[PDB]
């Protein structure tokens, strides 16, 4: 509904002092957020926030297949021309 309030810690160090002093309700229909206190209020003092308390981004264990038990059952030899083979054989004389 409303903009996120006024921020009271902002303009404890004001970037500029207003050069002209008027009644403020003379342009009441101009502003977006507006609060007209009576010399003190209870909402001038309270603070509130919410915090992202630290992410958790796991790293998956990059498994080398040789760094694993099953690569003693199998030979693993590379052959960078396997897309060009179309037929292959092992001869097995006993």
């Amino acid at each position: 509904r409303d903009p996120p309030g006024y921020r009271y810690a902002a303009a404890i160090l004001p970037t500029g002092s207003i050069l002209s002093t008027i009644e403020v309700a003379s342009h009441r229909r101009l502003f977006d957020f507006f609060a007209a206190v009576r010399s003190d209020e209870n909402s001038l003092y309270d603070v509130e926030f919410d915090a992202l308390l630290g992410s958790y981004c796991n790293t998956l264990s990059l498994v080398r297949f040789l760094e694993l038990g099953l690569s003693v059952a199998c030979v693993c030899t590379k052959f960078p021309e396997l897309a060009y083979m179309n037929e292959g054989r092992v001869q097995f004389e006993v």
């Binding site: 998956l60 990059l62 498994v63 080398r64 297949f65 694993l68 099953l70 059952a73 199998c74």
Partner: protein, 49 residues
């Protein structure tokens, strides 16, 4: 844009491409083990028989 954010939005697309490419190259390191068992269970009749 060369501003402070558009330098940064480049880096977020770099880390995705890095951690997309780290997975799929590791997938063949996992697909190797999955290729073991589906041809070793082409052979290996059961012990009871």
């Amino acid at each position: 844009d060369g501003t402070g954010i558009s330098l940064h939005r480049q880096l977020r697309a770099i880390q995705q491409l890095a951690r997309n490419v780290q997975a799929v190259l590791g997938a063949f390191e996992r697909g190797t083990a999955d290729q073991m068992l589906h041809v070793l269970l082409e052979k290996a009749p059961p012990l009871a028989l």
